[PDB]
Design a protein around this nucleic acid. Sequence first.
RNA 1: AAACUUUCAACAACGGAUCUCUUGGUUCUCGCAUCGAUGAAGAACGCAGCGAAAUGCGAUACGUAAUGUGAAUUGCAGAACCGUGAAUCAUCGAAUCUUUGAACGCACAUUGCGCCCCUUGGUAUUCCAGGGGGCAUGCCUGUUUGAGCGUCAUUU
RNA 2: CGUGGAGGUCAGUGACGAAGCCUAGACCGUAAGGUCGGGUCGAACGGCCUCUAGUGCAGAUCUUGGUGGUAGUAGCAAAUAUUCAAAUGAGAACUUUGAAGACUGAAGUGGGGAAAGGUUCCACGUCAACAGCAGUUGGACGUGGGUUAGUCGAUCCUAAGA
RNA 3: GUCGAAUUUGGGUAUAGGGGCGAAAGACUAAUCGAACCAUCUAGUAGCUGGUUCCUGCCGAAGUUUCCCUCAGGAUAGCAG
RNA 4: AUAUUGGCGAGAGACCGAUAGCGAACAAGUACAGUGAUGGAAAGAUGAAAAGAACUUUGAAAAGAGAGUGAAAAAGUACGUGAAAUUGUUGAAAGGGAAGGGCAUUUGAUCAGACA
RNA 5: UUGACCUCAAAUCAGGUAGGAGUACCCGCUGAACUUAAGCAUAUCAAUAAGCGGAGGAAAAGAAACCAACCGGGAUUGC
Lengths: 50, 126, 119, 87, 146, 206
Amino acid sequence: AAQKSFRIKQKMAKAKKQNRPLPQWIRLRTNNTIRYNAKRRNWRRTKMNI
Amino acid sequence: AKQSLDVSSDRRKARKAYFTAPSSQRRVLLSAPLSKELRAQYGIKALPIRRDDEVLVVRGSKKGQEGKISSVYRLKFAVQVDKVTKEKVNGASVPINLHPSKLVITKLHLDKDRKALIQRKGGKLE
Amino acid sequence: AGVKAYELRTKSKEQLASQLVDLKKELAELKVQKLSRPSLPKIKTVRKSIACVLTVINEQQREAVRQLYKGKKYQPKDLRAKKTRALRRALTKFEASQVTEKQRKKQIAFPQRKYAIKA
Amino acid sequence: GKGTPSFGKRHNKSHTLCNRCGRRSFHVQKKTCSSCGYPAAKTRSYNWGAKAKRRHTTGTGRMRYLKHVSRRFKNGFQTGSASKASA
Amino acid sequence: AISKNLPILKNHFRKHWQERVKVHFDQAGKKVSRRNARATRAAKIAPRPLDLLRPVVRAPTVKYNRKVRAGRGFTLAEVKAAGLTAAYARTIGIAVDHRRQNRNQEIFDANVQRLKEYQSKIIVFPRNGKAPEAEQVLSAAATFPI
Amino acid sequence: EKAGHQTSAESWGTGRAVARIPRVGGGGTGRSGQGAFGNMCRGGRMFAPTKTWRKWNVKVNHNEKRYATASAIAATAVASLVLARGHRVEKIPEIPLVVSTDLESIQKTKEAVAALKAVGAHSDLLKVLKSKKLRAGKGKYRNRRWTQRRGPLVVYAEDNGIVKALRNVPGVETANVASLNLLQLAPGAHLGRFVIWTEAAFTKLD
RNA sequence: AAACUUUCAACAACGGAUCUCUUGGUUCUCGCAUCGAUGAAGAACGCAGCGAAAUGCGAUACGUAAUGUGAAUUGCAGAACCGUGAAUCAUCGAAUCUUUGAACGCACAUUGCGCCCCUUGGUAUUCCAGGGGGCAUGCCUGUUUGAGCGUCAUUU
RNA sequence: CGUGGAGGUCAGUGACGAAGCCUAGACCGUAAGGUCGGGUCGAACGGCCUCUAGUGCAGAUCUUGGUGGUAGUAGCAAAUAUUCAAAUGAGAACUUUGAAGACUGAAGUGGGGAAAGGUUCCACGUCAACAGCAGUUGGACGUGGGUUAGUCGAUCCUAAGA
RNA sequence: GUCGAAUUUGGGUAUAGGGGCGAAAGACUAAUCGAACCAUCUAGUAGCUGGUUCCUGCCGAAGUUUCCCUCAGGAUAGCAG
RNA sequence: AUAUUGGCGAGAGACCGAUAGCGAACAAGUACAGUGAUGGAAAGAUGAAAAGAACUUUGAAAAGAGAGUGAAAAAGUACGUGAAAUUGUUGAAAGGGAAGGGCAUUUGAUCAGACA
RNA sequence: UUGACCUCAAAUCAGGUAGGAGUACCCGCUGAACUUAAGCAUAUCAAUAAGCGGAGGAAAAGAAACCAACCGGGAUUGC
Ligand SMILES: CN[C@@H]1[C@@H](O)[C@@H](O[C@@H]2[C@@H](O)[C@H](O[C@H]3O[C@H](CN)CC[C@H]3N)[C@@H](N)C[C@H]2N)OC[C@]1(C)O
Ligand SMILES: CN[C@@H]1[C@@H](O)[C@@H](O[C@@H]2[C@@H](O)[C@H](O[C@H]3O[C@H](CN)CC[C@H]3N)[C@@H](N)C[C@H]2N)OC[C@]1(C)O
Ligand SMILES: CN[C@@H]1[C@@H](O)[C@@H](O[C@@H]2[C@@H](O)[C@H](O[C@H]3O[C@H](CN)CC[C@H]3N)[C@@H](N)C[C@H]2N)OC[C@]1(C)O
Ligand SMILES: [Mg+2]
Ligand SMILES: [Mg+2]
Ligand SMILES: [Mg+2]
Ligand SMILES: [Mg+2]
Ligand SMILES: [Mg+2]
Ligand SMILES: [Mg+2]
Ligand SMILES: [Mg+2]
Ligand SMILES: [Mg+2]
Ligand SMILES: [Mg+2]
Ligand SMILES: [Mg+2]
Ligand SMILES: [Mg+2]
Ligand SMILES: [Mg+2]
Ligand SMILES: [Mg+2]
Ligand SMILES: [Mg+2]
Ligand SMILES: [Mg+2]
Ligand SMILES: [Mg+2]
Ligand SMILES: [Mg+2]
Ligand SMILES: [Mg+2]
Ligand SMILES: [Mg+2]
Ligand SMILES: [Mg+2]
Ligand SMILES: [Mg+2]
Ligand SMILES: [Mg+2]
Ligand SMILES: [Mg+2]
Ligand SMILES: [Mg+2]
Ligand SMILES: [Mg+2]
Ligand SMILES: [Mg+2]
Ligand SMILES: [Mg+2]
Ligand SMILES: [Mg+2]
Ligand SMILES: [Mg+2]
Ligand SMILES: [Mg+2]
Ligand SMILES: [Mg+2]
Ligand SMILES: [Mg+2]
Ligand SMILES: [Mg+2]
Ligand SMILES: [Mg+2]
Ligand SMILES: [Mg+2]
Ligand SMILES: [Mg+2]
Ligand SMILES: [Mg+2]
Ligand SMILES: [Mg+2]
Ligand SMILES: [Mg+2]
Ligand SMILES: [Mg+2]
Ligand SMILES: [Mg+2]
Ligand SMILES: [Mg+2]
Ligand SMILES: [Mg+2]
Ligand SMILES: [Mg+2]
Ligand SMILES: [Mg+2]
Ligand SMILES: [Mg+2]
Ligand SMILES: [Mg+2]
Ligand SMILES: [Mg+2]
Ligand SMILES: [Mg+2]
Ligand SMILES: [Mg+2]
Ligand SMILES: [Mg+2]
Ligand SMILES: [Mg+2]
Ligand SMILES: [Mg+2]
Ligand SMILES: [Mg+2]
Ligand SMILES: [Mg+2]
Ligand SMILES: [Mg+2]
Ligand SMILES: [Mg+2]
Ligand SMILES: [Mg+2]
Ligand SMILES: [Mg+2]
Ligand SMILES: [Mg+2]
Ligand SMILES: [Mg+2]
Ligand SMILES: [Mg+2]
Ligand SMILES: [Mg+2]
Ligand SMILES: [Mg+2]
Ligand SMILES: [Mg+2]
Ligand SMILES: [Mg+2]
Ligand SMILES: [Mg+2]
Ligand SMILES: [Mg+2]
Ligand SMILES: [Mg+2]
Ligand SMILES: [Mg+2]
Ligand SMILES: [Mg+2]
Ligand SMILES: [Mg+2]
Ligand SMILES: [Mg+2]
Ligand SMILES: [Mg+2]
Ligand SMILES: [Mg+2]
Ligand SMILES: [Mg+2]
Ligand SMILES: [Mg+2]
Ligand SMILES: [Mg+2]
Ligand SMILES: [Mg+2]
Ligand SMILES: [Mg+2]
Ligand SMILES: [Mg+2]
Ligand SMILES: [Mg+2]
Ligand SMILES: [Mg+2]
Ligand SMILES: [Mg+2]
Ligand SMILES: [Mg+2]
Ligand SMILES: [Mg+2]
Ligand SMILES: [Mg+2]
Ligand SMILES: [Mg+2]
Ligand SMILES: [Mg+2]
Ligand SMILES: [Mg+2]
Ligand SMILES: [Mg+2]
Ligand SMILES: [Mg+2]
Ligand SMILES: [Mg+2]
Ligand SMILES: [Mg+2]
Ligand SMILES: [Mg+2]
Ligand SMILES: [Mg+2]
Ligand SMILES: [Mg+2]
Ligand SMILES: [Mg+2]
Ligand SMILES: [Mg+2]
Ligand SMILES: [Mg+2]
Ligand SMILES: [Mg+2]
Ligand SMILES: [Mg+2]
Ligand SMILES: [Mg+2]
Ligand SMILES: [Mg+2]
Ligand SMILES: [Mg+2]
Ligand SMILES: [Mg+2]
Ligand SMILES: [Mg+2]
Ligand SMILES: [Mg+2]
Ligand SMILES: [Mg+2]
Ligand SMILES: [Mg+2]
Ligand SMILES: [Mg+2]
Ligand SMILES: [Mg+2]
Ligand SMILES: [Mg+2]
Ligand SMILES: [Mg+2]
Ligand SMILES: [Mg+2]
Ligand SMILES: [Mg+2]
Ligand SMILES: [Mg+2]
Ligand SMILES: [Mg+2]
Ligand SMILES: [Mg+2]
Ligand SMILES: [Mg+2]
Ligand SMILES: [Mg+2]
Ligand SMILES: [Mg+2]
Ligand SMILES: [Mg+2]
Ligand SMILES: [Mg+2]
Ligand SMILES: [Mg+2]
Ligand SMILES: [Mg+2]
Ligand SMILES: [Mg+2]
Ligand SMILES: [Mg+2]
Ligand SMILES: [Mg+2]
Ligand SMILES: [Mg+2]
Ligand SMILES: [Mg+2]
Ligand SMILES: [Mg+2]
Ligand SMILES: [Mg+2]
Ligand SMILES: [Mg+2]
Ligand SMILES: [Mg+2]
Ligand SMILES: [Mg+2]
Ligand SMILES: [Mg+2]
Ligand SMILES: [Zn+2]
């Protein structure tokens, strides 16, 4: 950690990208049931387990 | 009743079949009936609705109104007519969704294919 | 607009390879545009075409190499029939129906005879 | 002692990520995944393990190939392509 | 676990017997499934009768020796006495069993007669042309009871 | 049978201040530490779980069956039972109603519906269609959505097409004389169904 | 006497029972016989004008080719028909199919490290870089090529 | 007596309001219960003859969910410590700036790293939740930017070991 | 108490459940050890403890006999419908 | 001919009806826990239609009060019905170390039927 | 000197093939204890669970070294 395997870095890249809220236009779609992004993630809440 | 062992009277299987049906299957679900005058003209009772068709609301609040169909909204199982609208209290206006089974076709939009389909059904075509 | 399939399948190998660099070069210019602009759905159609071009370029050289390999034992695997791994090993119609010399004579002399009853 | 103070000592990985199943069941030292059994030639599963079976068998994934087989069979594994009709 | 005046029962469910339960819900389902597959043989089988001719036979033991029912096949001895080859009589829809033996003239006689009666009641379609369309009979053993 | 036992839970045993039903392992999910397997437990297996080897069909003695239908037939005369059963027969010519063998050959609903009406079946044919109602219960999920009364039983001798002719009129049922079904002759085990006998049928009876 | 307490009612809270809903589950029956070294099952990481996810897909990436239908898609923006043509359509026979996995150049807690054939480039069979095609194992039939006073004839 | 469902029936009740819920309102039953009014409500439901069972709860330190009294209570008191003015803001005991009083006292409360985390870094915005007072402040929320090597590491080598 | 050594300590590496490891306490082996943890056999068995859901009507007990590795249980007779 | 809690395609039930039915009717083997093997949830319903409440006004704001839409806001994205425990207000009645219960009657409140 | 033969090897030799997945049903191996016996060891659970190998749309079995004792029967599987 802070000398990272690129494998670990890449999972950690994909980490960041999932870390954003709902794009709020999905809320507008016909039929659409998603109120909020319920899979969100915090660095000091719950941990990534490598 | 159904005599075919390949037909299903299952209410559940049907309600799913309907709500899951894709675009191409919905067009035929979105049939509207031909007008009394248009029935005798083409020798056809009803056809799957099409965008630029002209049509007459025969049921509901807007019954008696008529216009050109602005869009067929297949996702919503709804057909929108551009005359019929509601005005909101901001003063804007929004389409009213209409179901073809509650419409009737005054004026078809004729294509080579729409024409073909009528004769292909045994029609007339003025 | 945006490319049509049958209009590509006419063109020459050397034209297609050239129009490819067109679409890449057009797409590249659009890429630089798209970050200056609040949206650019145009890019969808150029890059969907760089696929359609490439499909045909490939389509040819395959149906080309398919042709010179035609009708001979041992041609390349991806031009070989897929079917099922297990069908691929099936006994061919010839060697299933291969019958026995001893047994052949018997199917001849003593075949199943059609017949019925009541009279 | 055996409690919370001894827990401050835990910074070491018994397992990193298994290449085969992408798990972090891959025991660093034993160099074998406690979940899928990689390196093993076959994939670890047991009959007292019905759930974990259910969690991994065919169909929990993409089925990038097997998806279509049932269709290709319905058509008898047609080769070539289709010609034309009308309209 | 022993009380009143009742027979001793030996009710055998001490293994996991609930695993090996077999219920026939397909009783009807299989009757149909096998009626179609009979009448779909009656087609694919052409005018042929749907069964094979069976011999008269005296039933074994002392209990059933009194009676007689259809045996398996016709004893090369009878196939020759009725005057045809075995290998051919196979393709005439006669069943020939090479294991059976004739210790009984009265049964051997009975079986040869039964054999000629079949040759007389059948029409053998020739190798090539013709086929004077014959309207298949559904049994043999019904035509030729015991 | 797999259902409800699909956890690994086990009793926490006494001394932990909470009751002893099995309890889910692990932690973090909030299902953990919850009563398992128990016939009183949310999610647990139910008491005496139902089995496919329950006795479903019931055997009846052949002669007893036939005695039953026999008694049911004799009630298709005996007007009061037919009247007491529903079946508006107060005006029909006579019990039993026997009808021309020509009925057996009718090819067309309108034609057949007429003959029925003609011979006294109007008030009964119409008792249905008024009697149509939505299923009172929860079966209306289960592909029995509609209640209705039962109309007449047209008993032919040979079917020349009366059968496809009546199959779409409601409440009406058709059956051969060689067969006869006690389920129809005494619907809901109540005697006196309304039977219209083609004269062909009636003499095949004896 | 108030407060407070308790009790009943109305209104309002609290909670989500009840009632009625049902693209789900469950059980029964019927028909069928099709995974993979031609790389499967499974993984990981990617891909959209605007997506986190489910779904779809693979650097040709919510898709390419083919065929059918005949005008949509829709949350906004964008584009847009008497026709080789709309569609987040149907069907699907042709392809693409990243890093992988029985997983096959060697490795792999590494985006670690070789060898061979073709080709471009820097003066270049030899060094450096790009482009392509390649090298696992057991076994079988075969083809070359060999080994052994295991053994046969033959030369002189 | 009552409940889920089933065959039969009353051509039963119902958007002119089914069901359910509410009701120190009314009536029948010895009682399980049954009927009625009013209110609330919104789409289905009952009487009779039969059929059927996953059919009636006060308890099982019963299962699940919900809620009380306890109770504005126990408490929020280790690590010496806070004070003045201005700015900003709707709002300042707590943010910012100045002023002051202090501390850690180089075996640091300083300056970097290993394991570990994974963007917490940094800028802009920003206070519903979080920071058991507060909140204009934050490791929070939103939105973006940021990690540049022939010489530092890995990579190579071998150790125990595999 | 000890504090320059039978010292403290990181990392790598080995040993795994009737097994390990133990300068020996039945200690330690992931808050688990006089036999770890995970799942399954498993709805393990219980002569023992707890519970066991609507109304009314009529009748109405026994704790005694004999036998039992029986003495908190059955068998049996009796009483009861 | 026989087997089939796997696969693919179909038809069905005196089955269950969101604490039921598979664990999962929902982005369910998901969120989450555990070094690991494994463990493993909760969570369906505004309306026919967003018509999802312009506009005014009070407030820093969240909101409130209006107005408005709608058949209904006693449906306001805390969204069908909306019970109970338990809670606020309002009204009624009563309370000398619990509260509630039984027969009976005064007192008040309340409800008939029933005369003709 | 040469050319065989037998045996054994080598090639990135020419071309094929095996692995893994699934495993309800099927062919085999291996294999418990809970439990029942009111104790308990043979026994029972059970030739069951668990572990392992191998298949197919079915598998297996099958045209008798069979069954019988009859006036004999006549591959296999199934009810
Ligand atoms: C999404 N881009 C597409 C482009 O990829 C292509 O799409 C064709 C589409 O036009 C075809 O459509 C055609 O197919 C019919 C086949 N008989 C004939 C008429 C036409 N509808 C589709 N069948 C296949 C797509 N690849 O042609 C049209 C387009 C818009 O440019
Ligand atoms: C009593 N029947 C109820 C029915 O009323 C309804 O209940 C909803 C419930 O589903 C909604 O909640 C739903 O949507 C929420 C969105 N914030 C999250 C939780 C989810 N269950 C509640 N907000 C209101 C209830 N009346 O849907 C669920 C149910 C159990 O069928
Ligand atoms: C429902 N409200 C009641 C209210 O009615 C009353 O209740 C009395 C109770 O105080 C008396 O209780 C006391 O007072 C009596 C007179 N001094 C003597 C007996 C004593 N226990 C009971 N005997 C009668 C109840 N109805 O006081 C208690 C209460 C809860 O407030
Ligand atoms: Mg809807
Ligand atoms: Mg944690
Ligand atoms: Mg952790
Ligand atoms: Mg839908
Ligand atoms: Mg309408
Ligand atoms: Mg509509
Ligand atoms: Mg811990
Ligand atoms: Mg340590
Ligand atoms: Mg270790
Ligand atoms: Mg799937
Ligand atoms: Mg015995
Ligand atoms: Mg089993
Ligand atoms: Mg037969
Ligand atoms: Mg013999
Ligand atoms: Mg079970
Ligand atoms: Mg089981
Ligand atoms: Mg357990
Ligand atoms: Mg279990
Ligand atoms: Mg245990
Ligand atoms: Mg325990
Ligand atoms: Mg306690
Ligand atoms: Mg666990
Ligand atoms: Mg359950
Ligand atoms: Mg009606
Ligand atoms: Mg109900
Ligand atoms: Mg008090
Ligand atoms: Mg209220
Ligand atoms: Mg609420
Ligand atoms: Mg509905
Ligand atoms: Mg179903
Ligand atoms: Mg197969
Ligand atoms: Mg990319
Ligand atoms: Mg899905
Ligand atoms: Mg999508
Ligand atoms: Mg499509
Ligand atoms: Mg691939
Ligand atoms: Mg990888
Ligand atoms: Mg490798
Ligand atoms: Mg290396
Ligand atoms: Mg190269
Ligand atoms: Mg390479
Ligand atoms: Mg009932
Ligand atoms: Mg029930
Ligand atoms: Mg009924
Ligand atoms: Mg009640
Ligand atoms: Mg009553
Ligand atoms: Mg009312
Ligand atoms: Mg009501
Ligand atoms: Mg409604
Ligand atoms: Mg009824
Ligand atoms: Mg009622
Ligand atoms: Mg029950
Ligand atoms: Mg009840
Ligand atoms: Mg109750
Ligand atoms: Mg209850
Ligand atoms: Mg209680
Ligand atoms: Mg509780
Ligand atoms: Mg509280
Ligand atoms: Mg509490
Ligand atoms: Mg307070
Ligand atoms: Mg205090
Ligand atoms: Mg203080
Ligand atoms: Mg304290
Ligand atoms: Mg202090
Ligand atoms: Mg302070
Ligand atoms: Mg200072
Ligand atoms: Mg200062
Ligand atoms: Mg100091
Ligand atoms: Mg600091
Ligand atoms: Mg915080
Ligand atoms: Mg706080
Ligand atoms: Mg505190
Ligand atoms: Mg605090
Ligand atoms: Mg605050
Ligand atoms: Mg501020
Ligand atoms: Mg900061
Ligand atoms: Mg932030
Ligand atoms: Mg370097
Ligand atoms: Mg080893
Ligand atoms: Mg000292
Ligand atoms: Mg063990
Ligand atoms: Mg050992
Ligand atoms: Mg020691
Ligand atoms: Mg120790
Ligand atoms: Mg522990
Ligand atoms: Mg421990
Ligand atoms: Mg133990
Ligand atoms: Mg043990
Ligand atoms: Mg039990
Ligand atoms: Mg137990
Ligand atoms: Mg008495
Ligand atoms: Mg004595
Ligand atoms: Mg005793
Ligand atoms: Mg005892
Ligand atoms: Mg006792
Ligand atoms: Mg007794
Ligand atoms: Mg079955
Ligand atoms: Mg619920
Ligand atoms: Mg559930
Ligand atoms: Mg419930
Ligand atoms: Mg139930
Ligand atoms: Mg659940
Ligand atoms: Mg959702
Ligand atoms: Mg979810
Ligand atoms: Mg609703
Ligand atoms: Mg719904
Ligand atoms: Mg709706
Ligand atoms: Mg407001
Ligand atoms: Mg307001
Ligand atoms: Mg109003
Ligand atoms: Mg209004
Ligand atoms: Mg309402
Ligand atoms: Mg209300
Ligand atoms: Mg409402
Ligand atoms: Mg709103
Ligand atoms: Mg509210
Ligand atoms: Mg509500
Ligand atoms: Mg309440
Ligand atoms: Mg009060
Ligand atoms: Mg007091
Ligand atoms: Mg006092
Ligand atoms: Mg005092
Ligand atoms: Mg007292
Ligand atoms: Mg080599
Ligand atoms: Mg080779
Ligand atoms: Mg295998
Ligand atoms: Mg396997
Ligand atoms: Mg057991
Ligand atoms: Mg025992
Ligand atoms: Mg015992
Ligand atoms: Mg013992
Ligand atoms: Mg096994
Ligand atoms: Mg078969
Ligand atoms: Mg075989
Ligand atoms: Mg035999
Ligand atoms: Mg047998
Ligand atoms: Mg059978
Ligand atoms: Zn793994």
